[PDB]
Design a protein around this ligand. Structure first.
Ligand SMILES: [Mn+2]
Ligand SMILES: [Mn+2]
Lengths: 199, 199
């Protein structure tokens, strides 16, 4: 089983005017592509070190594995969290849970925006599901640290706040990026991930 | 392979009165044993995750691997750094390097003691060799984080400043433990590690 770069499910310009084609092309075809390849390189190095019982080599490889492995996990989710058919508000059981756990959909938006804007440096904001508590939970992660691998929460919706995700279009003004991205959220996909947690 | 607890190179009471037999027996047969057992469990989980390509599981296993893997690496070195015939000062090229890089043996002791006393929480102090710079270097490490795996420095002499290493005998007074341990340093072993660094 070798990881592979997934195709983007839509045209590079499908998210205009909210996210321009230049960002989408660079973010997918350059940034994500590097993560998959570097993840595969690290896994092959780790397999060799593991078979030899070289614990020092295993530990030295952990930063590259989390960085590149998280990069592959996060971006693969991110593309599915967006869609030209997205935007608006969710419906059904997910909307009920958002209202129950955050008060309202608008309050949820404020909390996830605050967590995403609040990331100092590189990282991600996540809406997740806490399996043990059986409810939604917002968390932020640094760099490419993935939500489930580092927190156990199941990712539902991720907002990439790496500068490369918005800088070409919005420059330093990250809040302008957060406003635009709500128009392309694929709530159908987020619902599928949420419903997969409930049985 | 499967990691195994190495035999101690001497009796548990060989370091009296500086480190008592109760500490040595607990530290080796309980603390270190747990690291080996848990390290083997974590390595087996990682092998399974690698074959399935489960990157999330790999990343979730990193804390146990570094903690237990570092514990096995670190403690195995610590036992060899001590000897009932130890103490005093080194000789030959190692003493020359200590004088060159730290000024004198006494100044080296002050610096490594300060770094070891300066550890806030659990961790380790290390004298290492920087291969790229070709000289000695003092560093501190948190928890069981190993020197080479996390810094690239080759370990020469390690001082375990975890509370379990000295609390039974010295209680909260870590400086008394740090002073006593110099009497049992196996400079012969540290010298072997140093010469292994040089061609
Ligand atoms: Mn990105
Ligand atoms: Mn210890």
């Amino acid at each position: 089983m070798k990881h592979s770069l997934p195709d983007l499910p839509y045209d590079y310009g499908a998210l205009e005017p909210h996210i321009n084609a230049q960002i989408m092309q660079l973010h997918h075809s350059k940034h994500h592509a590097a993560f998959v390849n570097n993840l595969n390189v690290t896994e092959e190095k780790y397999q060799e070190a593991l078979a030899k019982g070289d614990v020092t080599a295993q530990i030295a490889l952990q930063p590259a594995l989390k960085f590149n492995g998280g990069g592959h996990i996060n971006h693969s989710i991110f593309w599915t969290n967006l869609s030209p058919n997205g935007g608006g508000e969710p419906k059904g059981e997910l909307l009920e849970a958002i209202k129950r756990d955050f008060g309202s959909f608008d309050k949820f938006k404020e909390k996830l925006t605050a967590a995403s804007v609040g990331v100092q440096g590189s990282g991600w904001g996540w809406l997740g599901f806490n399996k043990e508590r059986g409810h939604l939970q917002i968390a932020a992660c640094p760099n490419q640290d993935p939500l489930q691998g580092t927190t156990g929460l199941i990712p539902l919706l991720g907002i990439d706040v790496w500068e490369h995700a918005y800088y070409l279009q919005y420059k330093n003004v990250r809040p302008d990026y957060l406003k635009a991205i709500w128009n392309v959220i694929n709530w159908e996909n987020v619902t599928e991930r949420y419903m997969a947690c409930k049985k």
